[PDB]
Design a protein around this ligand. Structure first.
Ligand SMILES: CCCCCC(=O)SCCNC(=O)CCNC(=O)[C@H](O)C(C)(C)COP(=O)(O)OP(=O)(O)OC[C@H]1O[C@@H](n2cnc3c(N)ncnc32)[C@H](O)[C@@H]1OP(=O)(O)O
Ligand SMILES: CCCCCC(=O)SCCNC(=O)CCNC(=O)[C@H](O)C(C)(C)COP(=O)(O)OP(=O)(O)OC[C@H]1O[C@@H](n2cnc3c(N)ncnc32)[C@H](O)[C@@H]1OP(=O)(O)O
Lengths: 389, 389
């Protein structure tokens, strides 16, 4: 009787998964980067560790971040001395913060993205929620469902404790959800709060110190779907091919452990050099099949782990300086927001290109690449195409 | 120049995601249910609590569980008194145990599945790993890549802190991964270890007391793929349709919080009646399109949260007593192993059907249903088609 192949032909979408809307949010508290070392040493009761402040000064001076947005305020840190210490039991206080903040911030971003899209929220068929800050049951995907008033049957993908490469990983997942299901509209939400990682300075874990110079909060939300309705929905970027890989020789480059003292990050190798050394290989796996080899001829999105990863990739490939502008603007204005970062980048780029009358949303170029970098050393690759105007 | 539609048509698979191999593993420590009450009340120094202990003994005797496999032994518990109190700082100790044991026990289940499949492990293109115990960076997905030797460019989906419905989630996931990607072969691994949730008794927290009587350890692994190679690969079940919903009036029915004291679970509503009240809705969403209304003419796989879930569903629907046989038999031999449990039920049903010479792997019937139940209160539905012989 019932035929599965008829069911399967009727059930699937036909074209490429497309980004149809993008919206972001950050916590109100703006933290200036120039005065941060003072603030950070005072609030962590470390003024006396004079030599360690000099090193953080330099790290912030070199970060290429102007400001960061943070849920943690001095009023909040005053109330929490165990979080200002380098290693004290604090996971219950940090979880109370981030199980609420993560979905609140996520909701902000998602309302934005849904207004842009224009279409009834009841048409949202799937939800991906991604965060590296805290875990809970029901997850932030269930909170976000309630907060936004999504249908209770929305199909949910909760991606918890992912790491900084996961803006790449949510795209890679939405691609297949959108593409395999006719009519599917996926609401994608990356929301990262560093309240779980903030800790005091320690002269014997400089790698934790580097983290403290760079990470910032932010959420980004996307509407993803295949076969857009022309002149009703508005394609921004199309996803064409994706990959995930683990660099050779990179065991321990980036690890993070959730413990009683919260999420402690540990940098045990040369991340800038490991990305730069393996990005060519990623490029040729993505573009060799498209016949493209000039990497200045595609538009770029690269998670800005730190400025050094960017310079060292730019140097290695001979990218023109201009290739990393969008990526650097996002790093300057918001710091490293982990998984959300690459999505703020995509907004930046598409906004600048439209604002400035370029021919496509990918800086006037046809084909583009987004890279996610994080624990494992993992590299996520998504190949994009822009959309005219 | 380059055609995205020609790429999209060449990239995607053609037929239904199909389950091609299933392997399971459990810790070697076998815990008998009949004597658990005495053992647990002794190892947690709670033998004065006579009324409570009697309460427990009625839960264990009604559980319909004969034994469970537990990584936690007497020797381990004796080096972790913090783990035997109801609420003592002990997440660091418990994480150390599960960050290692989850991947360890998944590897055992995966090797078994890979061996049944018969093909080179380098043809594994995607890996879904699911667990409610422990979180870490790089994740258990990374550990299992390294541990099994999969290619470094295996596409990973690390599902953390999911809970007990996530046997359905991982199949819903794996269906789109396999269907949208020509040649994709998805290794699926659910591995659950109750070391994060094990704790002593408290008379003001009987809900926690109930999970202590039911949760057990275990991992199950699948190979999922579309367009199986005829006579080289061997289909066991096909997936046809899936759904995830949140039952109405169930906020806080199952909560789980990861804290400095480990994973604590809270039952704030009536789980067995929420499930039973909402299970018919789920069945008509699933089977009305298929023209099927008789719920005894399909085969059944239900997450056994506890035996009252099963008996209340059975009574609501007037299921013959035998529908629930494979479910019940896994409950009896292993207890509630959270996400892994529904996968062990597929294995049991297909092994019994085959061993007894029935016509299909779904007990001789064509169509079946698999249900996952857990935090939300969430209901995961997967519609399955059996395979001849
Ligand atoms: C969320 C999950 C996953 C994580 C992944 C992605 O986010 S932490 C994730 C990835 N981020 C990174 O890997 C950071 C990469 N590093 C950078 O971006 C940059 O190194 C920087 C912004 C920190 C500093 O810029 P520069 O490298 O241009 O400048 P410079 O080398 O003089 O840095 C000054 C301070 O070096 C500091 N320093 C910074 N990183 C250092 C490192 N890995 N090893 C040693 N020292 C380091 C030392 O104190 C150094 O020397 P002095 O003592 O002389 O002052
Ligand atoms: C991993 C993430 C996801 C979690 C989700 C799914 O796994 S823990 C969540 C899934 N499981 C459930 O949700 C609940 C399932 N409950 C059951 O299966 C059953 O009630 C049971 C096996 C525990 C007990 O069997 P019975 O119901 O047949 O028998 P009985 O009623 O006499 O149970 C004995 C005692 O259980 C305690 N008890 C158990 N559940 C109770 C409840 N909801 N409200 C009140 N009391 C309860 C009582 O002590 C009762 O009275 P005292 O004798 O005074 O005799």
């Amino acid at each position: 009787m019932v035929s599965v192949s008829e069911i399967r032909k009727a059930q699937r979408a036909e074209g490429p998964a497309t980004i149809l809307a993008i919206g972001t949010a950050n916590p109100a508290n703006c933290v200036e980067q120039s005065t941060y070392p003072d603030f950070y040493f005072k609030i962590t009761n470390s003024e006396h560790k004079t030599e360690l402040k000099e090193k953080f000064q330099r790290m912030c001076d070199k970060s290429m971040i102007k400001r960061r947005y943070m849920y943690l305020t001095e009023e909040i840190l005053k109330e929490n001395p165990n979080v200002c210490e380098y290693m004290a039991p604090s996971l219950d206080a940090r979880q109370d913060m981030v199980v609420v903040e993560v979905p609140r911030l996520g909701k902000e971003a998602a309302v934005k993205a849904i207004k842009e899209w224009g279409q009834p929220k009841s048409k949202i068929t799937h939800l991906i929620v991604c965060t590296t800050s805290g875990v809970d049951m029901p997850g932030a995907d269930y909170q976000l469902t309630k907060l936004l008033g999504l249908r209770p049957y929305v199909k949910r993908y909760m991606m918890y404790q992912q790491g900084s490469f996961a803006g790449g990983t949510v795209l890679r997942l939405a691609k297949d959800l959108a593409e395999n299901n006719k009519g599917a509209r996926v609401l994608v939400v990356c929301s990262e709060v560093t309240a779980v990682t903030f800790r005091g300075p320690s002269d014997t874990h400089l790698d934790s110190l580097v983290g403290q110079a760079l990470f910032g909060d932010g959420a980004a939300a996307l509407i993803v779907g295949s076969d857009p309705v022309p002149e009703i929905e508005k394609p921004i970027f199309e996803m064409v091919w994706t990959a995930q890989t683990i660099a050779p020789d990179s065991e321990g480059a980036i690890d993070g452990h959730l413990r009683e003292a919260g999420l402690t990050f540990h940098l045990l190798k040369d991340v800038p050099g490991i990305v730069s050394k393996n990005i060519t290989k990623a490029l040729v796996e993505a573009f060799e099949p498209l016949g493209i080899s000039d990497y200045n001829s595609i538009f770029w999105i690269a998670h800005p782990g730190g400025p050094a990863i960017l310079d060292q990739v730019e140097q290695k490939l001979a990218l023109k300086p201009e290739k990393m502008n969008a990526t650097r603007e996002v790093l300057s204005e918001y710091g490293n927001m982990s998984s959300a970062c690459v999505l703020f980048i995509l907004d930046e780029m598409r906004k600048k290109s439209t604002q400035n009358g370029l021919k496509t949303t990918g800086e006037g170029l046809e084909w583009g690449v987004l890279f996610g970098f994080g624990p494992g050393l993992t590299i996520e690759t998504v190949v994009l195409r822009s959309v005219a105007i």
